[PDB]
Amino acid sequence: MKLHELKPAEGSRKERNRVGRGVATGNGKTSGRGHKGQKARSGGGVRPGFEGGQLPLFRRLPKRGFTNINRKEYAIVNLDQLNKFEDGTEVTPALLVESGVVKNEKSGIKILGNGSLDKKLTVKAHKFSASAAEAIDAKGGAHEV
Amino acid sequence: PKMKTHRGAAKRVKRTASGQLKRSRAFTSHLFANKSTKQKRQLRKARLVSKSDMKRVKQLLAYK
Amino acid sequence: PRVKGGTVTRARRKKTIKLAKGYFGSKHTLYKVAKQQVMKSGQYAFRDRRQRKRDFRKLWITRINAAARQHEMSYSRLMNGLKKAGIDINRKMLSEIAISDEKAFAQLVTKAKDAL
Amino acid sequence: NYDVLKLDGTKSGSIELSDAVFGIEPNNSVLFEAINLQRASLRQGTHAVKNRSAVSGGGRKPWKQKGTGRARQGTIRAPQWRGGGIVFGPTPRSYAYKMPKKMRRLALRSALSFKAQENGLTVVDAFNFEAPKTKEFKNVLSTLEQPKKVLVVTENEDVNVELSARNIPGVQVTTAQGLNVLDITNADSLVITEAAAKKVEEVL
RNA sequence: AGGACGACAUUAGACGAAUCAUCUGGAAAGAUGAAUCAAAGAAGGUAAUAAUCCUGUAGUCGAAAAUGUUGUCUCUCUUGAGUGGAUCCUGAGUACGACGGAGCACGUGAAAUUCCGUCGGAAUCUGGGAGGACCAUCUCCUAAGGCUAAAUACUCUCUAGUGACCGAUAGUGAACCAGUACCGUGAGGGAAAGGUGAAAAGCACCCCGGAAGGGGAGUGAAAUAGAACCUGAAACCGUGUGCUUACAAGUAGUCAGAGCCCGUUAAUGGGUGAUGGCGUGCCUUUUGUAGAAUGAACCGGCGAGUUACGAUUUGAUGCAAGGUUAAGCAGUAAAUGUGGAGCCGUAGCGAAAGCGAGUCUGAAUAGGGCGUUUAGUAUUUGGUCGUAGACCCGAAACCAGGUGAU
RNA sequence: UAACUUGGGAGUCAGAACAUGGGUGAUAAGGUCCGUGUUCGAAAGGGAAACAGCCCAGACCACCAGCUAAGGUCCCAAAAU
RNA sequence: GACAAUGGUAGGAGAGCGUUCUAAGGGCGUUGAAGCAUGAUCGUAAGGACAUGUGGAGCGCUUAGAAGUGAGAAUGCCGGUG
Ligand SMILES: [Mg+2]
Ligand SMILES: [Mg+2]
Ligand SMILES: [Mg+2]
Ligand SMILES: [Mg+2]
Ligand SMILES: [Mg+2]
Ligand SMILES: [Mg+2]
Ligand SMILES: [Mg+2]
Ligand SMILES: [Mg+2]
Ligand SMILES: [Mg+2]
Ligand SMILES: [Mg+2]
Ligand SMILES: [Mg+2]
Ligand SMILES: [Mg+2]
Ligand SMILES: [Mg+2]
Ligand SMILES: [Mg+2]
Ligand SMILES: [Mg+2]
Ligand SMILES: [Mg+2]
Ligand SMILES: [Mg+2]
Ligand SMILES: [Mg+2]
Ligand SMILES: [Mg+2]
Ligand SMILES: [Mg+2]
Ligand SMILES: [Mg+2]
Ligand SMILES: [Mg+2]
Ligand SMILES: [Mg+2]
Ligand SMILES: [Mg+2]
Ligand SMILES: [Mg+2]
Ligand SMILES: [Mg+2]
Ligand SMILES: [Mg+2]
Ligand SMILES: [Mg+2]
Ligand SMILES: [Mg+2]
Ligand SMILES: [Mg+2]
Ligand SMILES: [Mg+2]
Ligand SMILES: [Mg+2]
Ligand SMILES: [Mg+2]
Ligand SMILES: [Mg+2]
Ligand SMILES: [Mg+2]
Ligand SMILES: [Mg+2]
Ligand SMILES: [Mg+2]
Ligand SMILES: [Mg+2]
Ligand SMILES: [Mg+2]
Ligand SMILES: [Mg+2]
Ligand SMILES: [Mg+2]
Ligand SMILES: [Mg+2]
Ligand SMILES: [Mg+2]
Ligand SMILES: [Mg+2]
Ligand SMILES: [Mg+2]
């Protein structure tokens, strides 16, 4: 391409709409605000969620629950994802991270049973679903926490 | 600057897999002698934030 | 960058003023009142293009009426007779004929009367 | 396969350059975004005006709200006033933005491939300049039969080549690491040493 | 606390390449032709637009004197380790408590951690403090004495530069003898106002006039550039005139139309208009305005949805079960390289423990809620929202510090 | 020949007359409050002298062509003394 | 080729005109740029040319980019003049 023949990708660009520039635009004068009231004013309009004095939804409804200070959450790996390692592989958290199956380890690696395992592996993880452990064993492999 | 979460709403909802907002139920605080057994039993069950309310409040929970 | 008012304003207003040539006094001189008058002129011209067709048909009808009465026939009965005779000459042409060669119009009148 | 010429124009040999760098179909969408991005990044953005708060004076109400027959006014520096504050207007800001690295690399490869396909790619064995001489570099360009706008690419900073080409209108000098979409696209022809071409091929 | 010597830098400067001709023109840098330098084609000036005419630029050189930063000598100061556990020391009206306040993102709260006033008031290495009331255990520390560069903030100022910043109603209030003139007792408020020409060559002399002013003559490319002297729009004011008008009821035009006068971007032309039809300005605001509701004397200039950061959606593009970097560092204030900390996605359900393609509810393998039975992510155009004055102008007022009893 | 779903953007929350079913008022109001329809609002054109809301009828632009609607045809003023 | 639609306020959607600046390309200009003035010119609109006079040195065009981008009204501000 040449600097005197530049062309943006079709549909990538659109000219911004300018209000208050005459009647033919269709946004002259009141500039799309209609006539009068709070919403016609510079800076006007109520808080999002305000309902004009009707008790708002998030005050008529009640609060629920608490957050556990010691909450644990595990990086999850399913069997279908384990299917990428060569049979006989020793799958470990380090290998999962390096291979890019797991990005953030969180509180540790849990193996879950979605999909089908098609390889024999020795899997080391912090936790296993009952189904995940059963599938790993049934494919001839082994698992350890 | 960053937009601020509405903390009361955040204390009152949870986002579901499809992006909806699970909510608890009004009329579940007191005066249970004035509501029928069936009323209270069914008020025990959570609902979702309605579509019409979502139009109004969705930005309050953008980070939720 | 800043865009100063520049020349566009004067060019646009001058065009409206030139369109107002011949108007009375301030109306050929001042942009605001010239603009208003040119707006009125456009609206009037739009309306009068349509009114002109009416006016000219009215003129033709009046002249045809006069010619028919000279032949002892009303406009209304002459047009009815021409219709029943199958003659499709329109009012403009009938008027011009009545003006320009009376013998031809008399022949048309006789055709109408025979059809009636 | 591309010819490798000597500064006198004769064929020193041949070189193999990956078509994955010089042989791709250029992606014009990505190339346009890259060019726009570079041009935006060059902007200084130092522009400002004085709003009604910033203009000097204007504290007091010019005359009482009612009774005088005049329009109500609140400060002599309001925007409709001659000498008043500007409504909005420029305010200093950066225009630079980013695109994903993969898109940067794709843009560079697209520009280089466009040169290769337009036949505006010339490979030279080396620049053996010991002292800076604009006249000698001009003669070398003429003997290589180059157009007015030439981008000269060395492997690393070549002081004598830079100094010899610096004053020639339309001639820009860069290194393999310094290649950018604006320079490549502006140039009509690229004159790249064999070492620089190999370095570029490694990088991209 | 000093001293000697040296280096570098700042405060003046010096050298510094290369073009001639003709044409137009008042003038050449323009055009044309033929050359030349370039580590110099940054820039300004010169009678129009110059790499080669000037000032310069690249590059190189330069300091009597003062100042600054530094190096080496000198100078000054100065011991450094281990073993032992008998005794001794290791910051007191302190720590801490109660009450009243304050500060901690934390509004007194279950309120740790930290300060102030008032009152009370420890222990001593087998000690003391902390790990968000509190106790135990464990772990980490060792208060109630002091000092300490750098990375960070800012710009009245100086030097060298930069700008998809302004270009005389803009840009500083101030391009100009401006914080002036002017206003006010005072604090304080606060303007307007740039342009002869390349060169002043700035009109010798004659004529009307008291002068002002003018007509010639002359200078100049131009005076029709003659002193707020480049250009010179509009409102407004005059002189002349082609058509027209003194029986007529007019939002002033429009459509029809003779007569008269012209002759163009040459088009089934231009100016005028006897007479006929039709016809109550514009804006705002209204159920509805010719409205006797609002606004504008006229003309000109100026005068109102913006930008930043977040959110969301749509379009675009790259990559894709992946996608993407932030600060930082390098780079030319660039592109860009590097940087994987972090963020989003790849799994949901539950208040939670937790379980997991399921989970929660439930005594239930029942029923029901939310889920599973692919697509995301980064940047960006558009739309909309949030935080910001957030489209522009307008109160009456509130608070703070000053100035006034002429 | 529409309809529904999802998502982006709105405006509107002063309504009027007329006809008709009713309340109220006095089988008063160009009154007031509901139901139903039309028109105005946001609709120019023809008729009702003039006359948002009545009657006819919904203007993409041009024509010195034709047929009709409401309403009209002695003159103003087109068409039947 | 046919035949269907095209009144419209708030408002939504689309396509465009013109202004200043920037980038690249390609041009114009003392044999006269911009500006101004006049004309019987062209385009569906915003608007675009051409000729002549004035003027005296700067300015188009193409593609893309960016905005202090368009005024008739605010008892608007400043100036000039009725
Ligand atoms: Mg648009
Ligand atoms: Mg509209
Ligand atoms: Mg308006
Ligand atoms: Mg709107
Ligand atoms: Mg309004
Ligand atoms: Mg209202
Ligand atoms: Mg509204
Ligand atoms: Mg209430
Ligand atoms: Mg309870
Ligand atoms: Mg400008
Ligand atoms: Mg203007
Ligand atoms: Mg007045
Ligand atoms: Mg200003
Ligand atoms: Mg010199
Ligand atoms: Mg020289
Ligand atoms: Mg010469
Ligand atoms: Mg206390
Ligand atoms: Mg404690
Ligand atoms: Mg304590
Ligand atoms: Mg604890
Ligand atoms: Mg420090
Ligand atoms: Mg000026
Ligand atoms: Mg000023
Ligand atoms: Mg000023
Ligand atoms: Mg002048
Ligand atoms: Mg007379
Ligand atoms: Mg309305
Ligand atoms: Mg009223
Ligand atoms: Mg009146
Ligand atoms: Mg009013
Ligand atoms: Mg008035
Ligand atoms: Mg005005
Ligand atoms: Mg806003
Ligand atoms: Mg006294
Ligand atoms: Mg009524
Ligand atoms: Mg009423
Ligand atoms: Mg009704
Ligand atoms: Mg009507
Ligand atoms: Mg009528
Ligand atoms: Mg008929
Ligand atoms: Mg008649
Ligand atoms: Mg329409
Ligand atoms: Mg229609
Ligand atoms: Mg729109
Ligand atoms: Mg503007």
CA-CA distance, A84 to A75, in Å (whole number)? 18
Q: Which of B22, B30, B54, B57 to mutate to test the interface with A (most CBs of A within 10 A)?
A: B57
Q: What angle do CA A88, A90, A94 make, to 5 degrees?
A: 150
Beta-bridge partners for A52? A54
Q: How many C-beta atoms lie closer than 10 Å to residue A115's C-beta?
A: 13
Name the DSSP class of D168. S
3-state SS, one letter per residue, for chain A:
CCCCCCCCCCCCCCCCCCCCCCCCCCCCCCCCCCCCCHHHCCCCCCCCCCCECECCHHHHCCCCCCCCCCCCCEEEEEHHHHCCCCCCCEECHHHHHHHCCCCCCECCEEEECCCCCCCCCEEECCEECHHHHHHHHHCCCEEEC
Cα separation, A35 vs D141, in Å, equals: 70
Q: CA separation (Å) from C69 to C57, C58, C72, D11, D199?
A: 18, 17, 5, 108, 107
φ/ψ (deg, to 5) at C38 = -65, -35
Angle between helices C8-19 and C31-70 (to 10 degrees): 30
Report angle CA A56, A43, B5 to the nearest 5 degrees.
Answer: 45
Q: Would you state the structure tokens that stand for residue C56, as one six-digit string?
A: 């000219």
- B56–A51 CB contact, under 8 Å: yes
Do the beta carbons of residue A90 and residue A143 sit within 8 Å?
no
- D155, D150, D159, D148: which is closest to D126 by C-alpha? D155
Q: Inter-chain contact D186–A12, Cβ cutoff 8 Å?
A: no
Question: Beta strand D150-154 with A122-124: parallel, antiparallel or unpaired?
Answer: unpaired
Q: Which ranges of chain B would DSSP assign to H, the alpha helix? A: 7-12, 37-43, 51-57
A8–D29 C-beta distance less than 8 A: yes
Q: What is the tally of structural domains in chain C?
A: 1
Query: Do residues C34 and C16 lie in contact, with contact meaning Cβ atoms separated by under 8 Å?
Result: yes
**Residue environment code for A22-57, b if the CB has 16+ CB neighbours within 10 A, otherwise e:** eeeeebeeeeebeeeeeeeeeeeeeeebeeeeeebb
CA distances from B26 to A7, A58, A141, A142, B60 (A): 58, 10, 53, 51, 20
Output the six-digit token pair for C36.
């208003």
Q: Give dist(CA D179, CA D173) in Å, integer.
A: 10
Backbone φ and ψ for A76, nearest 5 degrees, come out as -100, 145
Strand order from edge to edge, sheet including A127-128: A75-78, A109-112, A127-128
Segments forming the whole domain that contains residue B43: 1-60
Q: How far apart are CA C36 and CA C16, in angstroms?
A: 10
**D194 touches D4 (CB < 8 A):** yes
For C9, the enclosing helix (H) or strand (E) is helix C8-19
Nearest to A140, CA basis, from A113, A114, A116, A119: A119
Cα(C80)–Cα(C60) distance, rounded to whole angstroms? 16
Which residues of chain A lie closer than 8 angstroms to D114, CB-CB?
Answer: 1
Residue type, A111: I
Handedness of CA D66, D68, D74, D80 (dihedral sign): positive
Residue of A nearest to D25 (CA): A1
- Dist CA D161 CA D152 (whole Å): 9
Q: Which residues pair with D13 in a beta bridge?
A: D4
Nearest-by-Cβ selection for A62 from B28, B53, B57:
B28
Q: How far apart are CA D77 and CA C17, in angstroms?
A: 35
* CB-count exposure of residue A96 (10 Å: 0-12, 13-18, 19+): buried
- Note the CA–C1' distance, D55 to E20, in angstroms: 58
Q: Nearest CA of chain B to the CA of A60: how many Å?
A: 6
Query: Solving technique for this entry?
Result: cryo-EM
- What's the structural domain count of chain B? 1
**Is residue D53 packed enough to be buried (19+ CB in 10 Å), middle (13-18) or exposed (0-12)?**
exposed
Which of A46, A51, A59, A61 is most worth mutating to test chain B (most B CB atoms within 10 A of its CB)?
A61
